[PDB]
């Protein structure tokens, strides 16, 4: 019973291992194993639950263990090990074959098979930890191991794609430990985590790995927003080390999401409004990306309201996620009509929901945008309007108060009007008739290069596959 | 069965007179004895509440109503079993003998079709489609194809379903496509625009209503004055003033609908005032159109305020096109409105980007905004760049 369960999963694990084993040996095929490793994460997670945990026990006995003897026992110690044929050396699948890692040449240390075996061993360990939700001592123990091992080994172009997915598990397992319980050991542990990211980033820049730098930057930018340090994030994004070529669309959408929140508090929403749009377009529409689409859609509505523009209501209607968008719908109506009591009562009841995503601090700026938008509505519809006519609509304080609020928006060119104190009425200074001016021409010259932007990123991609197509023999 | 749902619809919201519900109650009491309304009769209190919806003697026992004839009694309870035995059980054994004796094929299919109409009389939608399902395989010509659609068409008017109805009508037309006369084609067309009134598709509902003939009468599915109201009234909100002259105000048919039935007062009082450019008396015509037409009709209660407000936006738009400016005393006074109420009408029209104009206070001059040389090469042309930029790189960025 238990014997047939251990040999079935290990045969499938070696079958998937031998595929990427022969591809990295000859020249550089590394683009091919990258596609296999995408499905390896999903195929291993479903396989971990079946055949209990014993698939990883016999796999270590098969190959040679540099560090991995005590790590399995320590992993099996927390679960109250049940020992069945647990003596090392019970299952031997090698039997002296070249693809089986021939034992005599391996045990005599005349050849080194550890490079591809050890780096692949750490990948399967991190998968069971996140699947079984094992925390506390097992999180810190594995962090003290993998990090020193990566500094000793020299990662080639193919080897840099191994640990690239291991950096995600180091940061994820640490954040789940901090949110579960807070202590003095959690703050000091994050200090080393921030120090290790800066040392390996320089090494990854020399190898010019696209997936490695894409995974690091996404994890590094998130740490900056947790501590709230702009000076660290501002200088980091100025280098532009993030390759846009071979990175996946899921890694791109996460990159544009960070830039929207950085420029939001910098009071420049012109560039931030495009970053939140690019994050949605690059993110897939499937169910696994709903976690990113839920947060990105909530940030888009916050960016618009801070610009003075009001987003469309169909976004809160035709979508299927509107159940979570209900708190942001009441903020849409309160800004339009300019009601002061409606905005104060809206953020009071939903304050509990706004604390989770930390968007309640951005709602403080919305208190000013309620009046700024109401002035824009009445100024565009009414060209020449008196001074006291505004205070009778929005129920403002006095005539001197509204005079200062109108002169505030003309700084950035929002209202585009003038205040005449002698005559005592505000007149709109926009006569339109800009068709004869050169202002539309500035956008025209930019849209000429926008069409050519997709031209240089495309024609190259046609010949990209054609090499291996024409090199293979055709019938 | 639409005659019951049309009259009993007044039991929902009546802001004018209670006698409108009492007069409509005579049709509900008369038709319930001939055909059992029980699914819709119970659906009256289960649809809308806090008017007549709190009066039931069966599910929840309470009384709040302006009409006391919606309550169950011992007569409807006995007739419920009598209609099930006489119209179904008696006729089901006769068809069962035909299936055992193996007499004909299409004749047996028409037996379940004719019997399926009795399930609509007793108000059973589950067995109505079950009887037609057995005759669906034997259906060849349009004789048995349309009869299946008839029951599906009853789901929309009788059971108030805008979803599962229009989906089945598109499947029947894709199976055998002939169309017969205009009335058989309007069942795939006029009814399609009726379901679009619920989801508020704007012109998509009135596309097939204008081309539909005014002679279409389905009786149980719809009446003569029912299609006459949905075709004439909806076509006014959709077609602009360019199409109102050669279609609405001048028609060989529509002009005969309001002439026969004087309760419309839509294509006449509204179009003549827009053609004569007299807006002083044009405003009270909207009240008679809203209260006595839009409210009492069933599918015209979905939009509610979206009707008159769209006309209040387009009534000034016609005046803006004929003058470069406008006076305050001729608008906020001579038209019957006031200064504060006119400012509230046009206050929300401009920021919605539906139209463009200029309003003044001291001078009181309403100026019309014109595109001049901008037109579609100013915004739409610039918007066209980013409109085709995203959809072009959407499938190109994913490669395979």
């Amino acid at each position: 019973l238990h014997h047939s369960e251990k040999k079935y999963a290990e045969e499938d694990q070696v079958q998937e291992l031998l595929k990427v084993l022969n591809e990295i040996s000859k020249t550089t095929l590394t683009l091919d194993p990258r596609y296999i490793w995408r499905s390896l994460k999903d195929l291993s997670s479903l396989r971990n639950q079946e055949l209990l945990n014993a698939e990883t026990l016999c796999f270590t006995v098969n190959v040679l263990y540099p560090d991995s003897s005590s790590f399995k026992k320590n992993l099996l110690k927390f679960i109250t090990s049940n020992h069945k044929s647990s003596v090392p050396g019970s299952a031997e699948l090698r039997n002296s074959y070249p693809a089986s890692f021939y034992s005599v040449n391996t045990e005599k240390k005349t050849i080194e098979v550890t490079a591809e075996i050890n780096c692949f061993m750490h990948l399967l360990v991190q998968l069971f930890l996140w699947d079984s939700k094992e925390l506390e001592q097992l999180v810190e123990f594995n962090r003290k191991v993998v990090i020193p091992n990566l500094l000793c080994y020299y990662n080639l172009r193919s080897l840099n794609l191994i640990n690239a997915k291991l950096w995600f598990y180091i940061y994820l397992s640490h954040e789940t430990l901090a949110r579960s319980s807070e202590e003095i050991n959690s703050d000091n542990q994050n200090i080393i985590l921030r120090s290790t990211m800066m040392k390996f980033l320089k090494i990854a820049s020399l190898k010019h790995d696209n997936e490695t730098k894409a995974m690091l930057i996404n994890l590094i930018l998130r740490d900056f927003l947790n501590n709230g340090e702009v000076d660290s994030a501002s200088d980091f994004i100025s280098k532009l080390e993030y390759p846009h070529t071979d990175v996946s669309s899921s890694l791109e959408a996460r990159y544009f999401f960070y830039l929207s929140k950085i420029n939001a508090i910098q009071l420049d929403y012109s560039t931030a409004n495009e970053y939140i749009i690019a994050a949605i377009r690059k993110a897939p529409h499937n169910s696994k990306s709903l976690g990113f689409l839920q947060q990105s859609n909530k940030l888009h509505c916050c960016i618009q309201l801070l610009m003075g523009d009001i987003p469309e209501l169909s976004f809160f209607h035709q979508s299927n996620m509107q159940k979570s968008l209900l708190p942001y719908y009441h903020l849409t109506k309160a800004v339009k009509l300019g009601d002061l009591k409606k905005f104060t009562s809206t953020i009071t009841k939903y304050k509990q929901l706004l604390l989770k995503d930390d968007t309640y601090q951005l709602c403080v700026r919305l208190r000013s945008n309620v009046i700024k938008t109401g002035i824009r509505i009445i100024s565009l519809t009414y060209k020449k309007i008196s001074l006291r006519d505004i205070c009778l609509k929005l129920n403002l304080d006095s005539e001197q108060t509204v005079e200062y609020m109108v002169s505030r928006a003309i700084r950035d060119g929002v209202i585009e009007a003038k205040i005449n104190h002698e005559d005592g009425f505000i007149e709109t200074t926009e006569l339109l008739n800009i068709y004869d001016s050169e202002d539309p021409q500035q956008v025209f010259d930019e849209r000429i290069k926008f069409a050519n932007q997709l031209h240089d990123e495309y024609l190259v991609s046609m010949r990209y596959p054609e090499d291996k197509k024409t090199q293979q023999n055709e019938k | 069965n639409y005659e019951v749902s049309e009259k009993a619809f007044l039991l929902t919201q009546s802001k004018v007179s209670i006698e409108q519900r009492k007069e409509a109650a005579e049709f509900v009491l008369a038709k319930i004895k001939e055909e059992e309304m029980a699914p819709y009769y119970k659906y009256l209190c289960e649809e809308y509440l806090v008017n007549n919806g709190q009066s039931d003697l069966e599910h929840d026992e309470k009384s709040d109503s302006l009409n006391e004839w919606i309550k169950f009694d011992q007569e409807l309870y006995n007739e419920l079993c009598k209609k099930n035995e006489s119209k179904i059980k008696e006729l089901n054994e006769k068809i069962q003998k035909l299936e055992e004796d193996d007499e004909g094929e299409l004749e047996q299919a028409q037996a379940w079709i004719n019997l399926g109409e009795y399930y609509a009389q007793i108000g059973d939608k589950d067995n109505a489609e079950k009887t037609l399902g057995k005759s669906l395989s034997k259906a060849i010509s349009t004789g048995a194809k349309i009869d299946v659609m008839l029951t599906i068409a009853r789901l929309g008017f009788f059971y108030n379903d805008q979803l599962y109805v229009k989906e089945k009508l598109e499947a029947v037309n894709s199976m055998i496509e002939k169309g017969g006369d205009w009335e058989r084609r309007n069942r795939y067309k006029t009814y399609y625009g009726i379901h679009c009134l619920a989801v508020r598709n704007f012109k998509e509902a009135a596309k097939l209503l204008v081309d539909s003939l005014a002679t279409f009468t389905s009786i149980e599915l719809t009446s003569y004055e029912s299609i006459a109201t949905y075709a004439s009234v909806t076509g006014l909100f959709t077609l602009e003033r360019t199409d109102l002259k050669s279609k609405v105000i001048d028609s060989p048919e529509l002009l005969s609908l309001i002439s026969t039935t004087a309760a419309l007062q839509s294509i006449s009082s509204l179009t003549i005032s827009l053609y004569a450019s007299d807006y002083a008396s044009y405003f009270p015509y909207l009240l008679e159109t809203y209260a006595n037409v839009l409210i009492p009709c069933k599918y015209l209660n979905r939009h509610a305020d979206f009707f008159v407000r769209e006309m209040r936006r387009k009534v000034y738009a016609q005046l803006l096109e004929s003058y470069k400016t406008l006076s305050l005393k001729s608008m906020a006074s001579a038209f019957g409105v006031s200064v504060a109420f006119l400012d509230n009408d046009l206050g929300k029209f401009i920021p919605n980007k539906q139209l463009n104009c200029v309003i003044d206070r001291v001078n009181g001059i309403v100026e019309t905004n014109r595109p001049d040389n901008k037109n579609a090469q100013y915004h739409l042309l610039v918007k066209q760049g980013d409109g085709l930029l995203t959809k072009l790189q959407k499938y190109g960025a994913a490669v395979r």
Partner: peptide, 27 residues
């Protein structure tokens, strides 16, 4: 799709226009 469907107005229903019939005779 902006300032259209659910927000609506909550005015311009009855009491506002019902008074306008009296203003015609007051001039």
């Amino acid at each position: 799709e902006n300032w259209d469907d659910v927000e609506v107005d909550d005015d311009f229903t009855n009491e506002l226009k019902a008074e306008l019939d009296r203003y015609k005779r007051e001039n």
